[PDB]
């Protein structure tokens, strides 16, 4: 009655506003017997979305 | 004049009467990423012609 815990209302987030993430289940088929590895972006260390 | 070496006329061959042979230049593509190895005869130790 004299002093109730006061709720924490204001909170900040500097990161991304998302709750879903895309994850890999089965790895890529590289290297393979048909498409030469020099084709895939991943072979050049290119960072993908 | 008195005794000349006599030629060796009669000779026998019990093997195959052929002078040409088929040879491998570049090995087979087995195993591979498409045809499962269980397809090729060579995977069952079958002797081929």
Those residues with Cβ within 8 angstroms of residue B34's Cβ, 6 or more apart along the chain or in another chain: A33, A34
**Residue A44 DSSP code:** G
Q: Tokens 């289940």: give the residue.
A: A25
Nearest CA to A28 among A8, A12, A9, A48? Answer: A48
Residues of chain B in contact with residue A34, where contact means CB-CB under 8 angstroms, are 33-34
Nearest CA to B33 among A39, A15, A32? Answer: A32
Token output for B12: 């026998």
Angle B35-B40-B46 from CA coordinates, rounded to 5°: 170
CA-based nearest distance B49→chain A, Å: 28
A30: closest chain B residue by CA = B33
> Testing the interface with B: which of A30, A32, A33 to mutate, by most B Cβ within 10 A?
A33
Quick one: chain A helix, strand, coil %, rounded to 5?
Answer: 15, 0, 85
Experimental method: X-ray
Token output for A20: 């879903």
CA A5 to chain centre: 37
Token output for B44: 């069952």
Q: Tokens 């195993």: give the residue.
A: B31
């Amino acid at each position: 009655l004299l002093h109730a815990d006061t709720p924490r209302l204001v909170t900040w987030d500097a990161g991304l506003c998302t709750s879903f993430k895309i994850v890999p289940i089965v790895p890529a088929q590289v290297p393979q017997d048909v498409l030469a590895y020099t084709f895939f972006t991943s072979s050049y260390a290119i960072q993908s979305p």
